Amino acid sequence: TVHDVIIIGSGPAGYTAAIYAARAQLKPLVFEGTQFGGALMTTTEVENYPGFREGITGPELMDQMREQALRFGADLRMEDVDAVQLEGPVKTVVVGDETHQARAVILAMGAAARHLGVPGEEALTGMGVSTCATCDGFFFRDQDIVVVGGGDSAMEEATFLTRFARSVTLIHRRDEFRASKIMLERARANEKITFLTNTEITQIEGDPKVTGVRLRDTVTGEESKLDVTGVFVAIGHDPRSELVRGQVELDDEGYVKVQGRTTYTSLDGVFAAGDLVDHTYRQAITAAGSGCAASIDAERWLAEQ
Amino acid sequence: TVHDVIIIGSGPAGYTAAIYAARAQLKPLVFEGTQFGGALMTTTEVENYPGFREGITGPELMDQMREQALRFGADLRMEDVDAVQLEGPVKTVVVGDETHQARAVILAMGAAARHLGVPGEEALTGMGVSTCATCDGFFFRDQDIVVVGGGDSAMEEATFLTRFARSVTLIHRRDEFRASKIMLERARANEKITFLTNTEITQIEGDPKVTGVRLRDTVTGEESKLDVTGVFVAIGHDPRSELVRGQVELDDEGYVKVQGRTTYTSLDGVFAAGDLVDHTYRQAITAAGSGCAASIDAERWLAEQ
Ligand SMILES: Cc1cc2nc3c(=O)[nH]c(=O)nc-3n(C[C@H](O)[C@H](O)[C@H](O)COP(=O)(O)OP(=O)(O)OC[C@H]3O[C@@H](n4cnc5c(N)ncnc54)[C@H](O)[C@@H]3O)c2cc1C
Ligand SMILES: Cc1cc2nc3c(=O)[nH]c(=O)nc-3n(C[C@H](O)[C@H](O)[C@H](O)COP(=O)(O)OP(=O)(O)OC[C@H]3O[C@@H](n4cnc5c(N)ncnc54)[C@H](O)[C@@H]3O)c2cc1C
Ligand SMILES: [Mg+2]
Ligand SMILES: [Mg+2]
């Protein structure tokens, strides 16, 4: 059995591709992962996804998307793809000890936000810990918060957040910043931003919501506690391109490269959508739009075979 | 009063840009038009917009989007922009005899699908008349339908539709086709497609839904009636770039050109989203994703000023 299309991933990109492919009668086979539903499964209220005047939670939105795909005939499997063979007329994915094949593959594995890896970080996610100023900055009006990171991302998150927050403490584990000089001086010019270099968070405190961070100086080991009600982690993203490295062309940071304004990768019959590709916008609505595009690309490409 | 951003248009691109800009505290001023709400205001059920497991009507979805923008502080005006001055640090839009100014402008005027311009076409829209095989092809299973057009669009719509329809009659007012030879031969190879050249529709019949089309031979004037329950118009699209012609760079078909995978136009501080730019995918979810991108671009650009 060679399917028309296999989709790898179950965030907004993968489920939108599945909805379109299923409605196009392609009978898409979708590997969602065991940690299915994408990044929004791991947040609370989603307010900037257009179509919900009063908002919707991440899990509620993603279940709508999943049920929508099912309604149109998508074959959803809550399992991880462990290896792929993407070159040639028939592509293979390996799922544990099972194999599945298809004429086209849509890559929608997303990107992982890098974690601090400290106690409290996971528990308090959506309760004061965030990875996305655009998404949750809104909810920290007049509060004292921290941003963690030393790159342009962190500089952009910190400066953007000062339009809501009472104060922003920008923490970085070294005394040198990889951020561009322009972003660095923008943050230095901001009166609401204080820098804490050679500093790391060792723990995030909070009974139901974030109440403080435990800090350590990375040179002297001196520890202290800072009272804050928000922690924004901005230490980078890791596109989930491990499966396809060596097969499809990646840029220097591991993002899957695509042709022009399409979803075509360097490999015939292989298409890529979402934050696996996009290192600029990184929103649910942009990932959903790209997943639709990937399925239209795949449909058009299949028609030419 | 110079606003941070003015948005022109109120389809998915314009309302998504408004939601993001308003939530970013930019207080966007949005000119929706008198025919507000975009193309979906002019359809019935929308089934492929991710997030609605049982679907939603076009007007219901667009009202959610409008109310969402309002909730976050967008200033919405149900009026047409009649002229723009887009060059320089301060942009001006003219609305009747009123003027409004802004540092950034987001162009989201969309594209008009070309109409047959015959009696019945407008009345039966969403009741058997469609402009979008991807969107409504689903609903014509085992039915006899027509597709109108002579280009690649029409060839793609007709061939795609044969996976649902019992038959497809492809009508074109000349005996020569502007479609590429590959698309033309794909349709000629399809056993479910019959060509009717030198033929035009003069009227679409239907008590509540489409029941037939009146046909005329464009050479001899011979008229007849065809029994069909669907009409797909695929005679092209006209991007609504009239306002900005001579100011922002357009391609040969009038679409606004953008830089790379961003929404930046040829003019500093001017950004473009949706079907005004995209002549490839033309879906609500892709237009919404691009409107989000336009507002993130605009936010980032404003921050650099
Ligand atoms: C905490 C948090 C809050 C956010 N809040 C918002 C918000 O309010 N608004 C907004 O617009 N955006 C928000 N975002 C961003 C948004 O969630 C992402 O931009 C979007 O989900 C990216 O979609 P994607 O489909 O490309 O990837 P992802 O969402 O990362 O989804 C990819 C999925 O595919 C699975 N997968 C990966 N590899 C495999 C494999 N080999 N086999 C099987 N499955 C696999 C993953 O486990 C994951 O479930 C938030 C992100 C985070 C982390
Ligand atoms: C009948 C029909 C059914 C469809 N069904 C579906 C479907 O089921 N699923 C799907 O994904 N897509 C569907 N589409 C396509 C989808 O509607 C479009 O791709 C999408 O709406 C494009 O969004 P946009 O914001 O770029 O432009 P548009 O939707 O065209 O919106 C632009 C808006 O801006 C206004 N505007 C323009 N110029 C000015 C001005 N000078 N001043 C003020 N306002 C102005 C316009 O009047 C319009 O209201 C359908 C389209 C049609 C025509
Ligand atoms: Mg996840
Ligand atoms: Mg309209």
Author numbering:
A (entry chain A), B (entry chain A): 6 to 310
What is the paper's account of this structure, in its own sentences?
TrxR is composed of a NADPH-binding domain and a FAD-binding domain. While FAD is tightly bound to the protein, NADPH acts as an electron donor and is easily exchanged. However, while the TrxRs from higher eukaryotes contain a C-terminal active-site motif that interacts with the substrate Trx, prokaryotic TrxRs depend on a conformational change between an oxidized (FO) and a reduced (FR) conformation.
Here, we present the result of a crystallographic fragment screening on M. smegmatis thioredoxin reductase (Msm-TrxR) as a model for Mtb-TrxR. These two proteins show a sequence identity of 77% and high structural similarity, with a root-mean-square deviation (r.m.s.d.) of 0.879 Å. After the soaking process the crystals showed diffraction to an average resolution of 1.8 Å. All tested crystals belonged to space group P3121 and included a single protein molecule per asymmetric unit with the FO conformation of TrxR. As a model organism for Mtb, crystals of Mycobacterium smegmatis TrxR that diffracted to high resolution were used in crystallographic fragment screening to discover binding fragments and new binding sites.
